[PDB]
Amino acid sequence: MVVSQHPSWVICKSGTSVKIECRSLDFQATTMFWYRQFPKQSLMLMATSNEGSKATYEQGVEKDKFLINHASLTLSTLTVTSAHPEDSSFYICSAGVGGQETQYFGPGTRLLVLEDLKNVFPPEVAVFEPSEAEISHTQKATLVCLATGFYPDHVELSWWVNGKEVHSGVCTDPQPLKEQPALNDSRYALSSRLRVSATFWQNPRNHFRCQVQFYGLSENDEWTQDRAKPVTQIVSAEAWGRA
Amino acid sequence: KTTQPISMDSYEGQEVNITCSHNNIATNDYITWYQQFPSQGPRFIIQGYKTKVTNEVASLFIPADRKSSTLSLPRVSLSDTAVYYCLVGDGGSFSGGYNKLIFGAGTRLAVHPYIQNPDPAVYQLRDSDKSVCLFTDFDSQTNVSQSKDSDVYITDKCVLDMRSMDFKSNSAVAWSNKSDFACANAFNNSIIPEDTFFP
Amino acid sequence: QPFPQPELPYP
Amino acid sequence: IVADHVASYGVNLYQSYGPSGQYTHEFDGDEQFYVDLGRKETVWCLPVLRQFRFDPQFALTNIAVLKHNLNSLIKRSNSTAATNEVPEVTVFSKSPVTLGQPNILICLVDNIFPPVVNITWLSNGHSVTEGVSETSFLSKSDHSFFKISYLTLLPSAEESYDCKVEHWGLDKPLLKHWEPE
Amino acid sequence: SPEDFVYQFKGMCYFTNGTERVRLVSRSIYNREEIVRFDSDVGEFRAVTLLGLPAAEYWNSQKDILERKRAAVDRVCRHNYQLELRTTLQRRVEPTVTISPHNLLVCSVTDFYPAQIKVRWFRNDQEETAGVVSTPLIRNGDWTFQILVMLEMTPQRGDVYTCHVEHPSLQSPITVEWRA
Ligand SMILES: *[C@@H]1O[C@H](CO)[C@@H](O)[C@H](O)[C@H]1NC(C)=O
Ligand SMILES: [Ca+2]
Structure with a gap:
């Protein structure tokens, strides 16, 4: 049993409505649920739905703002009417065969609502070659990457060796640190490491590239600022081996 | 409940x-x-x-x-x-x-x-000028601390698995644009072990 | 309360 | 199959005709309760059982599972519909006939498949709608059904009653007559 | 007569020796044909028809469903039976006995619960073995029953015929006699 959620990452202005789709992929969802998780809190049930109708919302949360359309035995979409910075949360949906005991959770959608998108900026990726002292002593070379100055932290870091993605000897921080925790609109910073053999790095034919996928304001998102548009881009840094 | x-x-x-x-x-x-x-x-x-x-x-x-x-x-x-x-x-x-x-x-x-043979050391990596300090190959009992200065940035310790040789190691990265900041003082307020290498 | 038993979906 | 007491928790039904659906709970043959999918409420056929509570929401979702399951089986069986069987009709009183005292007439319709029937009470060419009640389609070991229709009445010398049963498993509608004798 | 496709789910519970023997059998039917079933004695979904096979293989593939269905013996059957012990298994209705005549003699035992009954015919303190015809136990629906026991005979002056009826609600059998 596998459940998918689209979009994965979402950024919008205050007033914009966001459609989060919940889909059943290798089964037919008898009952589909909706959950809401805040920064450092547990999961909270919003509503329960069945084809065709209708939603069974829980408590303290209006249905004027949250709209669920469980039509189809695999589809159920949630709409957030007139988005407010309070709504900026992690949204996860469930699917069963059916009921809460049989439920299987989706990947989750990270929502971010802003008054204006002037705070959004893409990361500045920088890759650092390992010191000769490290290679001489440990007989291993650690390629350190650094992503700096990005808002929000809606980013995916990946290591690539000779045009192919590598997952062995890779380390990345689970949480990016704030560069200015004193300010509410503080830019984030994330670093990653890649370890390879001393003989593997000292070879010049091998190519090492740190790749950072950024998700930002795209399609219909007004940009009047003098600086470049911070659209969903892939900022990357690379360095070749040396003896 | x-x-x-x-x-x-x-x-x-x-x-x-x-x-x-x-x-x-x-x-x-x-x-x-x-x-x-x-x-x-x-x-x-x-x-x-x-x-x-x-x-x-x-x-x-x-x-x-x-x-x-x-x-x-x-x-x-x-x-x-x-x-x-x-x-x-x-x-x-x-x-x-x-x-x-x-x-x-x-x-x-x-x-x-679980690190049976630790080798704590701080290395300076330069870009392909700006540099970064690497506190690596330390035991799991050794803990890192956040920086007191706003211009000094320190990351939490993470483990990398190399299934090619079944080798594992802890790692920490630190950087600052402030003058003057050295790798010998970078992880001093952590505090680092007595058997640490500084080149 | 009387507890029932549910029917499962067909593939 | 050999047991002192047997119960169905519950008797789930869904058919293409209508489409119609039925949810019941039975013990030792007789019906305990039925959930109305329309008004979204549980109705107990016994007063001593009214003390407990059964949320209708389960029947509502379970019937939606049988909606998909029936639609799944039509594609699998290359469209194979139910075989219209012969319904057995019998009309009798609940208690011994006393001209003064009241009584309840019972029109038992057995061997019903598919569960689609029209039970009508007739009295002098006129149809009776006052003092009538019907039990829900009750399950059988041969996976068929039986339905009971009641009629509260006070017997009389010129008053005669009939039970018209309309089914797809009949060439002509069945009618069973009753007289107080 | 239009085409009708019927699907049934009978999540049944069986009981013997009070709470000593409990057997859970949940079966799925299409149309009047039982395609798949789940017995508590086997502990797995087993197909009866070729139409049952794709569901049974899929439901036995998922380990989570197995644990929930194995639990249904206690979660459904054993739990609900405790409620029955206080209501339905406490229900007792005393029957009404009436003999109507002559060559024919019928004993009309009306309105009783539970279904367990033992009605006998006697010809002057002597139990009649042959010449007795009984109608099947009639379910009235409204949690009451009735049984019509007829007895063929020959008339003689001074001969009394008794209808002996045994029921759990009754502390002693009813002595209803018909004089000739
Ligand atoms: C029952 O009566 C309705 C209304 O006259 C009719 O359309 C339907 O065909 C009847 N059903 C049966 C089983 O005869
Ligand atoms: Ca008594």
């Missing part, structure tokens, strides 16, 4: 046993467990009623009185570092009954490598 430990920190290849406490459990209630990774949806591990359950991921233990339950993981791997949620209930009105599944705080588990 339920009470389970706040957090646990264990070494690789050790049996981890999280205990859920539910004295007020109803006759027709399920013991369900979820594994949440940051930041994604929770993974359904195991579920049971009155009898002992066995999964490819873990194993559930339920005694006769049903006052408590224990989730036992076989050999914890570095990948098992997650939040483990314990839930009691019949699934609510849609199953149907009074007892609806509500998410508790959950046990924050963290798994650590």
Whole structure:
């Protein structure tokens, strides 16, 4: 049993409505649920739905703002009417065969609502070659990457060796640190490491590239600022081996 | 509803046993467990009623009185570092009954490598000018601390697995544009061990 | 309360 | 199959015709309750059982599972519909006939498949709608059904009653007559 | 007569020796044909028809469903039976006995619960073995029953015929006699 959620990452202005789709992929969802998780809190049930109708919302949360359309035995979409910075949360949906005991959770959608998108900026990726002292002593070379100055932290870091993605000897921080925790609109910073053999790095034919996928304001998102548009881009840094 | 430990920190290849406490459990209630990774949806591990359950991921233990339950993981791997949620209930009105599944705080588990031969050292890596300090090959008992200065940035310790030689090692990165900042003073307020290399 | 048993979906 | 007491928790039904659906709970043959999918409420056919509560939401979702399951089986069986069987009709009183005292007439319709029937009470060419009640389609070991229709009445010398049963398993409608004798 | 496709789910519970023997059998039917079933004695979904096979293989593939269905013996059957012990299994209705005549003699035993009854015919303190015809136990629906026991005979002056009826609600059998 596998459940998918689209979009994965979402950024919008205050007033914009966001459609989060919940889909059943290798089964037919008898009952589909909706959950809401805040920064450092547990999961909270919003509503329960069945084809065709209708939603069974829980408590303290209006249905004027949250709209669920469980039509189809695999589809159920949630709409957030007139988005407010309070709504900026992690949204996860469930699917069963059916009921809460049989439920299987989706990947989750990270929502971010802003008054204006002037705070959004893409990361500045920088890759650092390992010191000769490290290679001489440990007989291993650690390629350190650094992503700096990005808002929000809606980013995916990946290591690539000779045009192919590598997952062995890779380390990345689970949480990016704030560069200015004193300010509410503080830019984030994330670093990653890649370890390879001393003989593997000292070879010049091998190519090492740190790749950072950024998700930002795209399609219909007004940009009047003098600086470049911070659209969903892939900022990357690379360095070749040396003896 | 339920009470389970706040957090646990264990070494690789050790049996981890999280205990859920539910004295007020109803006759027709399920013991369900979820594994949440940051930041994604929770993974359904195991579920049971009155009898002992066995999964490819873990194993559930339920005694006769049903006052408590224990989730036992076989050999914890570095990948098992997650939040483990314990839930009691019949699934609510849609199953149907009074007892609806509500998410508790959950046990924050963290798994650590076991380093039989540590080699603590701070290395300076330069770009392909700006440089960064690397505190690596240190034991899992050695802990890093955040910086006091706003211009100095220090990252939390993380473990990298190299399955090519079954080699594992801890690592920490630090950087600052402030004059003057050196790698000999970078991890001094952590505090680093006495057997550390500084070139 | 009387507890029932549910029917599962067909593939 | 051999047991002192047997119960169905519950008797789930869904058919293409209508489409119609039925949810019941039975013990030792007789019906305990039925859930109305329309008004979304549980109705108990016994007063001593009214003390308990059964949420209708389960029947509502379970019938939606049988909606998909029936639609799944039509594709699998290359469209194979139910075989219209012969319904057995019998009309009798609940208690011994007393001209003064009241009585309840019972029109038992057995061997019903598919569960689609029209039970009508007739008295002097006129149809009777006052003092009528019908039990829900009750399950059988041969996976068919039986339905009971009641009629509260005070017997009389010139008053005669009939039970018209309309089914797809009949060439002509069945009518069973009754007289107080 | 239009085409009708019927699907049934009978999640049945069986009981013997009070609470000593409980057997859960949940079966799925299409149309009047039982395609798949789940017996508590086997502990797995087993197909009856080829139409049952794709569901049974899929439901036995998922380990989570197995644990919930194995629990249904206690979660459904054993739990609900405790409620029955206080209501339905406590229901007792005394029957009404009436003999109507002559060559024919019928004993009309009306309105009683539970279904267990033992009605006998006697010809002057002597139990009649042959010449007795009984209608099947009639379910009235409204949790009451009735049984019509007829007895063929020959008339003689001074001969009394008695209808002996045994029921759990009755502390002693009813002595209803018909004089000739
Ligand atoms: C029952 O009566 C309705 C209305 O006259 C009719 O359309 C339907 O065909 C009848 N059903 C049966 C089983 O005769
Ligand atoms: Ca008595």
